[PDB]
Amino acid sequence: SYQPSIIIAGPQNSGKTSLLTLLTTDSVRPTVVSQEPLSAADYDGSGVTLVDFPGHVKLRYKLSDYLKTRAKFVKGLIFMVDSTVDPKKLTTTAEFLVDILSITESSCENGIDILIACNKSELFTARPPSKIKDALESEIQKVIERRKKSLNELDVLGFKFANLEASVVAFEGSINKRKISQWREWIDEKL
């Protein structure tokens, strides 16, 4: 048996350690690049652990190993992105997300629910959450085709988020402005 948990994952610079800090201290504080996961056990007395995994390419195995051992006890996964990233430059982010989904959809009967947390909403060049989600979906189809063509030279999953067993929702937020109410509602559902 393990304790239920909710996972925070996604690319470097997205705001994962910043969110766990806000959720656990009610404050916004300086952070730098993470090398190990940050955990909050028995969050708000709910029995659920919150865990933030580093985003650096060379450390992705920490999240993969955790899902192989514990996926049946995971109540939800938050995939965080910086909303200002050019939606025509999402290849590396889409590879990360499709690698997560291959594991979550196959290791559980009904998959694991996903929140795409589109952070930094107060910035001028922040893109809308429905546009980010649509862009990621398109790029994941291209990643799967590239990997199929190379193999001739992901069967649990053209690609559409709606056709997954788990639910996938995208909402904006701003940690710096303390404006994350839709993310906090999603968390309160999964607790």
């Binding site: 656990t24 730098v32 190990e36 940050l38 909050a40 028995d42 969050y43 060379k58």
Partner: protein
């Protein structure tokens, strides 16, 4: 003179930061150091342990600025000093600056306090959480005030 001083956990939570020219602190500089360290783990070649380190073992990387750091074991903490191109004089200044910081840190029993605050329920906050800045807030402002 050196450039910046930073103290942080392996999770990226910052306990203390200082910029020598009063400039806005640059997380970007510290992050270029950390990401290089992940990509290229240390060997014998980066090691620095001499008289100027007060017998502490440090490691020194060049990021294409320099970064001299110590990794505390209990609890896990990074202490890093950044500076410009190496000279004899600057490698001495930085090495003595870092050994000083550690001696002053350990004199204020900051490492011991962090370990104590993690034990049991008494320092938990309203989210049932032990915040690493919990109950070391006053010791930290004293550490500040010797700079």
């Amino acid at each position: 003179m050196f450039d910046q001083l930073a103290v942080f956990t392996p999770q990226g939570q910052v306990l203390y930061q200082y910029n020598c020219l009063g400039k806005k602190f640059s997380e970007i500089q510290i992050n270029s150091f950390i990401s290089q360290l992940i990509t290229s783990p240390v060997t014998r070649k980066e090691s620095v342990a001499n008289a100027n380190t007060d017998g502490f073992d440090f490691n020194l990387l060049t990021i294409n600025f320099n970064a001299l750091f110590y990794l505390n074991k209990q609890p896990e903490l990074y202490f890093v000093v950044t500076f410009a191109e190496q000279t004899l004089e600057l490698n001495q200044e930085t090495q003595q600056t870092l050994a000083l910081v550690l001696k002053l840190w350990n004199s204020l029993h900051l490492s011991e306090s962090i370990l104590k605050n993690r034990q049991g329920q008494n320092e938990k906050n309203k989210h049932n959480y032990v915040d690493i800045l919990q109950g070391i807030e006053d010791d930290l402002k004293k550490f500040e005030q010797y700079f």
